[PDB]
Coordinates of C-alpha atoms in Angstrom, one line a residue:
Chain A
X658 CA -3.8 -15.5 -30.0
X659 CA -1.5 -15.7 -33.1
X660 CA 2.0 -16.7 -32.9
X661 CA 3.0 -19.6 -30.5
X662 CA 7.1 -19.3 -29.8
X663 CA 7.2 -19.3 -26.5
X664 CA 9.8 -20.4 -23.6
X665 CA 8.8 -22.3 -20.6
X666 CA 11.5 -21.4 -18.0
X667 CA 10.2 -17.6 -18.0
X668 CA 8.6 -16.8 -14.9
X669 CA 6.1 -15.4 -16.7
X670 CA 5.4 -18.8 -18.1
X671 CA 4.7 -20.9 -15.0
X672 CA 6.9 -21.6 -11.8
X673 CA 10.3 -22.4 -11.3
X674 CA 12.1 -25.5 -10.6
X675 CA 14.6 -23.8 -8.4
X676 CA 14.0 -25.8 -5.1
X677 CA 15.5 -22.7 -3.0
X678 CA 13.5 -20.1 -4.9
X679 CA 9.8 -19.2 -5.1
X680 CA 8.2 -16.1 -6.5
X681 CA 6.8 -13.4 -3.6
X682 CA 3.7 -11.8 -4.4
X683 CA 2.0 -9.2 -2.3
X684 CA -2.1 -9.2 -2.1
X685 CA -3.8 -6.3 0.5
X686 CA -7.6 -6.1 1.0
X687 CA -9.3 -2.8 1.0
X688 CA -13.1 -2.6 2.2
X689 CA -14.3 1.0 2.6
X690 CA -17.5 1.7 4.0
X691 CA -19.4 4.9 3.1
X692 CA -20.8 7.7 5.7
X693 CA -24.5 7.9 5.7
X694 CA -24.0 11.4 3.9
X695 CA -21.8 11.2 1.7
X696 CA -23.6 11.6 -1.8
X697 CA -24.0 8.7 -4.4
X698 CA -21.2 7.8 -6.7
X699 CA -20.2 3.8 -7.9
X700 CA -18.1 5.3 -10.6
X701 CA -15.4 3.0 -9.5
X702 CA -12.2 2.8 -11.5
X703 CA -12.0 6.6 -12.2
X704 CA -8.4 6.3 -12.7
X705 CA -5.0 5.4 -11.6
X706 CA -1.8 6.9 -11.7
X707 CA 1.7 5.1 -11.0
X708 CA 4.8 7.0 -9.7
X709 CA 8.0 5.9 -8.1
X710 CA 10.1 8.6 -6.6
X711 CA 14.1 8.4 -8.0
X712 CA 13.2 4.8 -9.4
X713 CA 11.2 6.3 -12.1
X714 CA 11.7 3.9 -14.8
X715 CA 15.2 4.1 -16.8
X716 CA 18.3 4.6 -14.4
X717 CA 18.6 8.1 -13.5
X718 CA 17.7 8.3 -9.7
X719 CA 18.0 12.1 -8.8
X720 CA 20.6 11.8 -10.9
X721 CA 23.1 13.1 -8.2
X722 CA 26.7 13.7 -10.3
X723 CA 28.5 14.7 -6.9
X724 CA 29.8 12.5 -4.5
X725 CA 30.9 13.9 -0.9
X726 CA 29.4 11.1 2.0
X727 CA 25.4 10.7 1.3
X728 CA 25.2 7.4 0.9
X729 CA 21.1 7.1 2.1
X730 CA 19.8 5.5 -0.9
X731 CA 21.0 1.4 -0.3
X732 CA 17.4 0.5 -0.3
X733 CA 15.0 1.3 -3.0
X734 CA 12.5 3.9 -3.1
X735 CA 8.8 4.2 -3.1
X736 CA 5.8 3.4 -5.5
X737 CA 2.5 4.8 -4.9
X738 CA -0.8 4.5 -7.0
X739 CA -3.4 7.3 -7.1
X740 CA -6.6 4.9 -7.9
X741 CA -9.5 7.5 -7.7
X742 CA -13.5 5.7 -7.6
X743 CA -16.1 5.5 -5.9
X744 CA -16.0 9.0 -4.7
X745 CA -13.1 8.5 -3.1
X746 CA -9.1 8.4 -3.3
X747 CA -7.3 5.7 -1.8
X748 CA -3.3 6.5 -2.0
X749 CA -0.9 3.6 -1.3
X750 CA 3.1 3.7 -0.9
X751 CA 4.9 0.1 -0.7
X752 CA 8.6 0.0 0.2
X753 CA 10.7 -3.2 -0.7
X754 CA 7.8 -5.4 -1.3
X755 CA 6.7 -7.7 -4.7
X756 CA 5.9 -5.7 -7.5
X757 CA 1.8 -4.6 -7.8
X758 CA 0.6 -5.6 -11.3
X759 CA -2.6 -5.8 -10.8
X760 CA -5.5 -3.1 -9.8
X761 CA -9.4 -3.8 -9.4
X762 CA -12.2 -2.1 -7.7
X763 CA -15.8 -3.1 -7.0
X764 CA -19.0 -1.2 -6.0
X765 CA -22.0 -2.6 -3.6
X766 CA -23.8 -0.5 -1.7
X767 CA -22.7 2.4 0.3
X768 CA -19.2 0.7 0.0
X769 CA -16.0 0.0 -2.3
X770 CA -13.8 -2.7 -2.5
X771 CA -10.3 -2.1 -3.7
X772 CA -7.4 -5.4 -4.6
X773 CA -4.1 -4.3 -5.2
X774 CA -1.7 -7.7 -6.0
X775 CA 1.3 -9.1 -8.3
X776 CA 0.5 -11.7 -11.1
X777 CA 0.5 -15.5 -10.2
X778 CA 3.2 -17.7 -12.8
X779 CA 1.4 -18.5 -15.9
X780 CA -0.7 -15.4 -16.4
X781 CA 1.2 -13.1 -19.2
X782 CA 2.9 -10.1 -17.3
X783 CA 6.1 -10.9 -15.0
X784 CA 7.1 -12.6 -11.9
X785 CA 10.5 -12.3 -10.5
X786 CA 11.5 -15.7 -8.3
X787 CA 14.1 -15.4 -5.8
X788 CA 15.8 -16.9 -2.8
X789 CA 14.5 -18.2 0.4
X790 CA 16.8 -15.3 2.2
X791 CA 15.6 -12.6 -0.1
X792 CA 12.4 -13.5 0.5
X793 CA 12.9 -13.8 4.5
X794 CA 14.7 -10.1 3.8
X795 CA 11.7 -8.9 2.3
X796 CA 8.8 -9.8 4.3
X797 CA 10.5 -8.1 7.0
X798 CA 11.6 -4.5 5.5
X799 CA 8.3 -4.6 3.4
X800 CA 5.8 -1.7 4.4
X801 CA 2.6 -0.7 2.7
X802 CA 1.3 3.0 3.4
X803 CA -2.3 4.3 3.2
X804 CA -4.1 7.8 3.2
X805 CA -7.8 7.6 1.3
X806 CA -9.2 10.8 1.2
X807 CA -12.7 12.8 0.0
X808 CA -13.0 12.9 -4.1
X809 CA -15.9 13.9 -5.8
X810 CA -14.6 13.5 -9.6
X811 CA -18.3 12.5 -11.4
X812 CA -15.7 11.6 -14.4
X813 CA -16.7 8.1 -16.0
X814 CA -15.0 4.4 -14.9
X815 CA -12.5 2.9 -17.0
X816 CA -12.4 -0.6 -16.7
X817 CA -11.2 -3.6 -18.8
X818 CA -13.3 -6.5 -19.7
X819 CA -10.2 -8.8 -19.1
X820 CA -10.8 -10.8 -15.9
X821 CA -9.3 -9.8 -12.9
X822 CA -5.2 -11.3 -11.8
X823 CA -4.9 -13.1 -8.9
X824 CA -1.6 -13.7 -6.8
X825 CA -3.1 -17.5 -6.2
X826 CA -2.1 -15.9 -2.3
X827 CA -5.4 -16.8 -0.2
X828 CA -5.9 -14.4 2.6
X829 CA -6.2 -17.3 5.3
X830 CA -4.6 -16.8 9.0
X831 CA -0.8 -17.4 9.6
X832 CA 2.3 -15.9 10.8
X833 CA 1.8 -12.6 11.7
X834 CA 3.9 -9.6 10.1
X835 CA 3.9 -5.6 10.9
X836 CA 3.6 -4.4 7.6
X837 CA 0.7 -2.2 7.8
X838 CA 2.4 1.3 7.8
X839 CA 0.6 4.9 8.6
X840 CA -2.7 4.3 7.9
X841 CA -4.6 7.9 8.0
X842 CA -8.3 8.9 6.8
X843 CA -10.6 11.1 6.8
X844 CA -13.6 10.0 8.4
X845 CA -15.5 13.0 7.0
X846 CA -15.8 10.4 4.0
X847 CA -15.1 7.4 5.1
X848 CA -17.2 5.6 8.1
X849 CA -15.4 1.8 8.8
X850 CA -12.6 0.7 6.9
X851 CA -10.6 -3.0 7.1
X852 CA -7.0 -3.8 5.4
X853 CA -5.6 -7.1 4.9
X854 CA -2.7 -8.2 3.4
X855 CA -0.3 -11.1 3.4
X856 CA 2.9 -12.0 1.2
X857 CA 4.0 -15.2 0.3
X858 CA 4.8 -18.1 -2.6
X859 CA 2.4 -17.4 -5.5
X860 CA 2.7 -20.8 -6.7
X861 CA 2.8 -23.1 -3.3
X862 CA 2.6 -21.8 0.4
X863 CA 5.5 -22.4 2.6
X864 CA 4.3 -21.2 5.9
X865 CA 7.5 -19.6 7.1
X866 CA 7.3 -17.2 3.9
X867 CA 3.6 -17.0 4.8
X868 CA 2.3 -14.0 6.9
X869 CA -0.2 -11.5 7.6
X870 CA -1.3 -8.6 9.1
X871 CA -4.7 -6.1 9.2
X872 CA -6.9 -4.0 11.7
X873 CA -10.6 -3.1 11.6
X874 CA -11.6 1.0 12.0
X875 CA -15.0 1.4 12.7
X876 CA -16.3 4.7 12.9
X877 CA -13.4 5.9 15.0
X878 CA -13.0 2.2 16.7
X879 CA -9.9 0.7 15.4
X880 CA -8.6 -2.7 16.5
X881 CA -5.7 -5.3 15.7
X882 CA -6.9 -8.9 15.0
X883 CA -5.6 -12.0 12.8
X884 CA -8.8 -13.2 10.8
X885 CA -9.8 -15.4 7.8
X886 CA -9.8 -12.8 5.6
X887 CA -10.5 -14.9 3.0
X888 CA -14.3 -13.6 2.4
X889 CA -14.1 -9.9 3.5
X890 CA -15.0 -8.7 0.4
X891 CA -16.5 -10.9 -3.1
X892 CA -13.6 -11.1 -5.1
X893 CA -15.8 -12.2 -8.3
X894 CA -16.9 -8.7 -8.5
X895 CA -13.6 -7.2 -9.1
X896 CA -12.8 -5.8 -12.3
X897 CA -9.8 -4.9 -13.5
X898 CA -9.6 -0.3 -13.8
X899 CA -6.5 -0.9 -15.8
Chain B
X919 CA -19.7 30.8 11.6
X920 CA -21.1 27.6 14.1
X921 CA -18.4 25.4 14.0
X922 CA -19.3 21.6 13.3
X923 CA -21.3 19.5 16.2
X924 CA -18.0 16.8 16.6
X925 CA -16.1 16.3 13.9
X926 CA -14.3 12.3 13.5
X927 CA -11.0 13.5 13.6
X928 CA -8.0 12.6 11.8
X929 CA -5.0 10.7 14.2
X930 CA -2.6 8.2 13.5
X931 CA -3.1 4.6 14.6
X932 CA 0.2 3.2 13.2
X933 CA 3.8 4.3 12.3
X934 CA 6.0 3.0 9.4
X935 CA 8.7 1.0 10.4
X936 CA 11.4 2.7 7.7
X937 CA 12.3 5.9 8.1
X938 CA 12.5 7.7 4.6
X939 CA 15.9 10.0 4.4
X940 CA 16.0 13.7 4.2
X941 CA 15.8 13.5 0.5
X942 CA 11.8 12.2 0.3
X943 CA 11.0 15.0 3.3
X944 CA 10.3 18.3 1.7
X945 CA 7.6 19.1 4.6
X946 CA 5.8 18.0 7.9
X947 CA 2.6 18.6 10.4
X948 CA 1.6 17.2 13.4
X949 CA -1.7 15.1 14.1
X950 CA -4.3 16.6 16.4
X951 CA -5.1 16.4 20.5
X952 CA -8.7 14.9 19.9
X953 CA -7.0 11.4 20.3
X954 CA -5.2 10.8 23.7
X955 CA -2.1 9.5 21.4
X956 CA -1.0 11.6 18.5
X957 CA 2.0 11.8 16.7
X958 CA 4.5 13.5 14.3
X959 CA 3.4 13.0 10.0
X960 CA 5.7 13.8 7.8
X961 CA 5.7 14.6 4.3
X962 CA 7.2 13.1 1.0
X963 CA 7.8 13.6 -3.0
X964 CA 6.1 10.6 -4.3
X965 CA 3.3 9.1 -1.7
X966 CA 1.8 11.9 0.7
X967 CA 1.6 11.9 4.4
X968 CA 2.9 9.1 6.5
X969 CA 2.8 9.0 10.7
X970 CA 5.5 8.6 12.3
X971 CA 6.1 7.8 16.1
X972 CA 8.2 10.5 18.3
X973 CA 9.7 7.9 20.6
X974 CA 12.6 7.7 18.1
X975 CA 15.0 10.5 18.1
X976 CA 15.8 10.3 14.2
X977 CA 11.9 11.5 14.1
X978 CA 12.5 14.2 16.6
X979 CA 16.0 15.3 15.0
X980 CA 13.9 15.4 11.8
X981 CA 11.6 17.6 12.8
X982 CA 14.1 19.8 14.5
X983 CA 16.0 20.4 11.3
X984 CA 12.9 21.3 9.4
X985 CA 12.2 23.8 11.9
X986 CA 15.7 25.6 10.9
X987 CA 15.7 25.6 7.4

């Protein structure tokens, strides 16, 4: 709380002014529903683990010192979180889409609830603005991938009593978006589960950088199907696994 | 050993739009026949296993050259 120099332009601070600019954020929806077998555990917020194949952290990237033709890379890499809980292991994998800054989980019943989502202006961590034809670049390459699994790690939650960072993103209907990659699971621990997600202006909507997309498994049943998404799971029991 | 009564099953119901070069595709395996519409998954370095559809012959190519070497 000390301390009090502090900018206003950073992006971190609040919006921009840039007409022709607004901040993307990415928001997807996980609710996983238990099988009627698989034992107790609400042990949420196990754990996570970042990784982000060649674009690490620093500048290295394979760090390939010999030129010949490959010229692959152009776009960037991966990033994929390992978030273990509730007795399961839900793996993601985005590709050219806003940068995930915050991670929650949730326990009620025989199901979890999982938001992954970037940071809203005005909130402390960062949030890079760009152009309308960045944005209209990214929407389109943007692709999320999924592949929950079976854990059984009784290991204790980790959570953070610091409230929970919304992308200010609803989850209403509009536009919609394939970005929904591969999207495999094993049934063996995992009866029904529903994705949502939807990328647009953190700070105001703008309807043409507003879309969606999600589908509904239910024991085996899956179907595609543009819904308010905006009460599929209670986000006021989200807490941050930090 | 009495197998299991009828196990879910574990087939792709969408395919990623990029495809990931060489480089982030050490391995590979194949979905299963319980679904009337399987598919071709492929492995990576930093995610796991992602689907991919076999009506594009980059996939198809792919796999071919990871049955060589």
């Amino acid at each position: 709380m000390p301390a009090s120099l502090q900018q206003s332009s950073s992006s971190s601070s609040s919006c921009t002014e840039e007409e022709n600019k607004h901040h993307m954020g990415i928001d997807v929806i996980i609710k996983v529903t238990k099988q009627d077998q698989t034992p107790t555990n609400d042990k949420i917020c196990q754990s996570v683990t970042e990784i982000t194949e060649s674009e690490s952290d620093p500048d290295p990237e394979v760090e390939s010192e010999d030129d010949s033709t490959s010229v692959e890379d152009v776009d960037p890499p991966t990033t994929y979180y390992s978030i273990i809980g509730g007795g399961l292991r839900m793996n993601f994998g985005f590709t050219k889409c806003p940068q995930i800054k915050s991670i929650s989980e949730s326990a009620d019943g025989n199901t979890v609830n999982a938001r992954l989502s970037s940071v809203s202006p005005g909130q402390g961590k960062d949030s890079p603005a760009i152009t309308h034809e960045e944005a209209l670049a990214m929407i389109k390459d943007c692709e999320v991938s999924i592949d929950i699994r079976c854990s059984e790690e009784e290991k204790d939650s980790d959570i953070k009593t610091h409230p929970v960072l919304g992308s200010n993103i609803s989850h209403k209907k509009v536009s919609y978006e394939d970005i929904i990659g591969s999207t495999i699971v094993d049934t063996k621990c995992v009866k029904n589960l529903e994705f949502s997600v939807r990328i647009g202006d953190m700070c105001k909507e703008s309807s043409e950088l507003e879309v969606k997309d999600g589908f509904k498994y239910v024991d085996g049943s899956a179907s595609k199907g543009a819904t308010d998404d905006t009460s599929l799971i209670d986000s006021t029991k989200l807490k941050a696994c930090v | 050993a009495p197998m299991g009564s009828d196990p879910p099953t574990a087939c792709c119901f969408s395919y990623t739009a990029r495809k990931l070069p060489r480089n982030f595709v050490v391995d590979y395996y194949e979905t299963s026949s319980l679904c009337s519409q399987p598919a071709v998954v492929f492995q990576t370095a930093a995610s796991a296993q992602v689907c991919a559809d076999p009506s594009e012959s980059w996939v198809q190519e792919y796999v071919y050259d990871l049955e060589l070497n």
